[PDB]
Amino acid sequence: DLYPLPAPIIDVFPDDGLAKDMAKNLNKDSVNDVIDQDDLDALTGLGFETSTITNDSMQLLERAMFNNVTDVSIMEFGAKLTEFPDITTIPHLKTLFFADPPGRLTRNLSLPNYQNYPEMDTITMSGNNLIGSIPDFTGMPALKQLYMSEMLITSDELPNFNNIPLLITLDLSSNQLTTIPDFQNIPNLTFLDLNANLLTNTPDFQNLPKLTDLNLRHNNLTGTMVNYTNLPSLESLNLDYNFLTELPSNVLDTIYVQSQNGELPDQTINQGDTCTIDLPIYFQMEETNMLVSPEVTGEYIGISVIQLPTTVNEEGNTITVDTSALSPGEYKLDVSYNHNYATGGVCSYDWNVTIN
Ligand SMILES: [Ca+2]
Ligand SMILES: [Ca+2]
Ligand SMILES: [Ca+2]
Ligand SMILES: [Ca+2]
Ligand SMILES: [Ca+2]
Ligand SMILES: [Ca+2]
Ligand SMILES: [Ca+2]
Ligand SMILES: [Ca+2]
Ligand SMILES: [Cl-]
């Protein structure tokens, strides 16, 4: 497929948009300018920005040998470019980058099981809707970083990667994952970003001995979660904006939580009774100095919100809301703590009470 050189750029790359971008990469003023192999050899990166390039025209890159190119960056692209091709003329490619275009999920991209880029180190496709699944890569043994945030990835599209043993960073934030694999073969993984997914738990990871940062902010973790037994390198576990009533005790010293919500059990009491709750997370946060303010408040929510006297029982680790003056009926109660009026943060727990 290699076009004979020397030749005009437009003859080597017979597509208006591709030729324009190649002239810019080659620092030639015109697509009519004649290039030779030395001009190609001077390139160490290729940038693309003309949105008329399509899958078919990008394939024309196989007509030229790029002996020294290690980076491909696609900064702007149209709807007819949905894949960077697996061509044989960029043998030393190390980084592949697609920009996150303006707007939300406006472009679609597929991720081939690339075979001709054995030196690939980093792939970034964040912000683009993934077409199909992420392949269980077989041709990129040196892959170290994978940025795949905001791509509408579901758990059926994410394999338990078998052949990328050097992976260090995996960013899957802002997707629709309901489960995450108990990753078997990425033991060098140090950073796992899962914020803004739909997770309800994770496995008690069996082989992540080097993981230092695990971000689970804004998921659906509810009540209790797995109490990790084998994350010896863990430094930060972000559980902010979940629905836990208790934090995992084995890793409590790594946790970031300032806001949290939750539901406590229904109770039935008699008119004149107070109402006492368990709230393990409050006591954990209090005792490990995670609170920014000390007050614990209670209220009931009807036509208006009415505050109730609320006391913390530190010996028995319970909280009592004084419901003794309420008449019989059905009530929605709330206990809140860690109020941060400056930031909008709060930890707030709701439950229903029947008073007979
Ligand atoms: Ca000229
Ligand atoms: Ca532009
Ligand atoms: Ca070289
Ligand atoms: Ca975007
Ligand atoms: Ca999908
Ligand atoms: Ca395996
Ligand atoms: Ca106590
Ligand atoms: Ca509430
Ligand atoms: Cl030549």
Layout of helices and strands:
Layout: E1 7-8, H1 9-12, H2 16-25, E2 34-35, H3 37-41, E3 45-48, H4 55-58, E4 71-74, E5 95-98, E6 108-109, E7 122-124, E8 129-130, E9 145-147, E10 169-171, E11 191-193, E12 213-215, E13 222-223, E14 236-238, E15 243-244, E16 255-256, E17 260-263, E18 267-269, E19 275-278, H5 280-287, E20 296-301, E21 305-308, E22 310-313, E23 318-321, E24 329-340, E25 345-355
Parallel strand pairs: 3-4, 4-5, 5-7, 6-8, 7-9, 9-10, 10-11, 11-12, 12-14, 13-15, 14-16, 17-25, 18-25
Antiparallel strand pairs: 1-2, 19-23, 20-21, 20-24, 22-23, 24-25
The chain binds calcium ion (8 copies) and chloride ion.
The site of one calcium ion has 3 residues, from loops.
Binding site for Ca(2+) 2: 68
Binding site for Ca(2+) 6: 162, 185
Binding site for Ca(2+) 5: 152, 157
How would you describe the overall organization of this protein?
The chain has about 350 residues and is mainly β. The protein has one domain (about 1-355). About 10% of the residues lie in helices and about 25% in strands. It is built from five helices and 25 strands. The chain has helices at about 10, 15-25, 35-40, 55-60, 280-285; strands at about 5-10, 35, 45-50, 70-75, 95-100, 110, 120-125, 130, 145, 170, 190-195, 215, 220-225, 235-240, 245, 255, 260-265, 265-270, 275-280, 295-300, 305-310, 310-315, 320, 330-340, 345-355. The protein is elongated and about 95 Å long. It binds calcium ion (8 copies) and chloride ion. One calcium ion binds next to loops. One calcium ion binds near residues 160 and 185.
